[model samples]
Target: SPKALEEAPWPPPEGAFVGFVLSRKEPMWADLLALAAARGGRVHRAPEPYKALRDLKEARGLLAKDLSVLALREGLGLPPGDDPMLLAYLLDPSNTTPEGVARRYGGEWTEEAGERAALSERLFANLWGRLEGEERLLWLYREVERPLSAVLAHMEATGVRLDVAYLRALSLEVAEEIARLEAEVFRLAGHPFNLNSRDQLERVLFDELGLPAISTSAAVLEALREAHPIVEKILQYRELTKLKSTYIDPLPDLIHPRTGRLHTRFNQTATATGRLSSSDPNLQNIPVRTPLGQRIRRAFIAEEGWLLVALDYSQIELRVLAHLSGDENLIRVFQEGRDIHTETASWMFGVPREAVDPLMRRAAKTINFGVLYGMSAHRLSQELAIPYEEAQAFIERYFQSFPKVRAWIEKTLEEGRRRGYVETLFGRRRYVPDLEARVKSVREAAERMAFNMPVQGTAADLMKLAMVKLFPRLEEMGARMLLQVHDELVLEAPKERAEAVARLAKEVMEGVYPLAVPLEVEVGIGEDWLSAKE
Candidate 1:
């Protein structure tokens, strides 16, 4: 009976694609498997054979089972219960692996294709039933998470373009600048000390120089920025050295030889509040305000005939906060299309909008964002370099100006305390056990999570849902989504298609959901990432 099983009947035409195991020619792709389920409303098993996504191109609906190892391999926008890995993640975000998820909830993890195929039907029924049972959780999985795996795979496949030569020269240039700063520091400190040694630095800056006796940490040093010229040079030297060592020096080696681009792995299950993080070098924190950060970004280029198109959401979190808190002032300011920071500064300082200066607006901007995280008086004091009392009073004044936001926080906290959890608009849940902890510090941290998660998580939900909606359209327009940095989505499109791509992305993003206030997007285009930011 040693017969070849005759290819197992290529691509089943109707029902769920059960047990799409392996990346081995027989180890089917996760996305394609998902498509099989979506295309056919019944559960059927099939083996590989479609190269052009003929099976994936037109997904209508679905159901599937334990999809972990290869879930990341690809997407065709899955509906809820389309795959168990995503369902498991939605239920308990702690794990996403196929076997890992199965084992977590009293099911056995199996490796054999036969056992896996057998178990898929059982677990799919169980996990999906539990998910549909949770209120609002099902919508999030069906609408956002299920469809998300596909877009991320597309992004990973079409990695961001980088200039290896540019980074190589920049590394050398920064090393020279660092060396010059070192010389300046030596001249000013009037001593030779290891810049890297904390003990040596502490003694030189405080003990020998007879300056204030505090640690040599960045915060302390920043407070003493004007104490001596040597301090400034040391800071510059440290910054340059860090930039050279961490970013500039190592970037060229990270490029893929096959594609000549840097592909970052986007982790969908990493954060508690539904944010996406990337590694193999984090592209998210390339500092926007620094000159050298701008230089480094210039190294991120587009393909020959393509230009980088950047679409950044404008004041998204604050808009999210406005909708949640129903703060009249916040909603009115946004509705009137005014500068929110300027309006906030005017209200906080008891001045007209026209009378608000750069300094005033800056402080208001800080407070506006800081409040989103339930910022404490001590933290605000440190942030603004004001006394603790003034910081406290300033916060009080802010709440008085936006009374409903204060009420909303109080309401959210009460509900959080009662339920031992917090939620966003989309019902993305985060169980915060420390809300009732005996320790004040632990309780405060959890309170911050409860207070911030809803707003930030809603913002995250918006960004994710927008990407889910925009991907197929981008494919049609011949653009590749390169990266998502918080509120920004950067893509590469042909030069001729750039303008249309920009318009289409903006409309899709802003129109993804209906909020009380309008969501706006700022669009940019350039040959490289840095110029695109402008």
Candidate 2:
């Protein structure tokens, strides 16, 4: 028994071990061969380590390929049809994983190899057909693997083009600005220091300035010390200057030479929800609150002969909440075709829409928007720089004034708890297996998702609908659909047809959803993105 460690078999039944190692102290190669012989499996070895490694890698890849196919058939709930995958795509705009599904129902699931194999076997026997061992494996390959491979291949081939030259030039400009700002920041501090180094900044801002420490991260803790207006100005200036010198200022300059366009890649497999992301300079994170950030938008121009059209849901995600919740007052306000924010401001402040100050409206807007992601009084206090109690009271009053929206949020969490999955307006399912776990943190996390999924998920679906509808229409109108940045699209066309393209893009987005409040878009035209925004 003591010597049995070296006698362990090779190629132990599928999922037998998590890893492979050769050692006299553990399982040795000779024992592996012996085990293979017992199982009637052949043992082959290559003289070269590289060759052996390559074969092992290839075999592992095949297993992953098989696993994906299995995931699709069982996870998507597709019947025997080529179109079921697409159906799954539409039903759950967010990709729902098997573990996620199990967790939504309060089940404990793990990603252990043995567990996965066991689960797959159980699913095969019960949901699928119980066949002879080889036949079952064959079924996994033929029914699941073949079609999914094709779909994945097609997705990979759909590559987006990038204007690297334009991006490089923009990067250079951003670098220069960064260098200039670093010097200016040093001058303002009355001495030279590392402007980019968090340690040095922490030393000056906290240790020297006596700022209070509020939060900590892997590298540093954020200190919160009451500061004078001038000091605050210095801080804000540093932040703004740094942001401009970094991503915000540089991205616009990186336009493509071939098309004078910056094509942001639309991802197919990134989100659990079918939402796409942009990169190669992610255009989504551009600063919108400051004039400086707004300047970056100007750089995102249509072509020399074309104008840019942008359509945004006038508070779309919020509107979706109202529609789904069926809150009478909220629905009525939307149906009346009045300004939702002004109305919210009126209710939140207990004043007429006209009497609501700009600051009150801004606070109300942040509360309305931020709470969707489970913002707390503490967070609001920090964001608005108010006392925690005041922030808490503000939240309470807003909810009290809008009971229906509150009910909708409550109902979503309840329904998500009841079911392991949540469906979007179009029936896209997202499995939240974590909901079913016994852990308190896991359960609470599920509740957060329950609240967020419908709002963010519906918004995501609305975008896909717009894209699918707009892409073909652009082709018909001879306009080039160049890039997608979350809720925005960029296009290029002949100058003569620019007006028509702008109108079409706007109309398609605004009319995509049959909701009460009208969708609105801000349109611009120019030689480049910057010129277009102006």
Best by TM-score: 1
* Reference-based lDDT, residue 86, model 1: 66
| Candidate 2 structure lDDT | 0.52
Number of clashing residue pairs, candidate 1: 7
Query: TM-scores of the models, in the given order?
Result: 0.81, 0.63
**Backbone clashes, each candidate:** 7, 30
lDDT of each: 0.74, 0.52
Badly placed stretches (over 4 Å) of model 2 are 1-184, 187-190, 196-221, 225-261, 352-359, 436-443, 530-534
lDDT of 2 by residue, 1-534 (tens): 012223232333332211112223211011111101111122222333222222231112112332222223223321111221232233343423444433432233353333332333333333223223434234333443333333332222222233344545555675676566566656655577765567777677666655555324332332332452324444555666666556554554544343333334434334655566554455567776466565555445444455554444556677788788777767777778766677777887787546728888778777877777778788888787788778888888877777877888777666776787776665555777677689998887877777777777777767666765676577677766555555665566677787788888878887887865455666655555555552
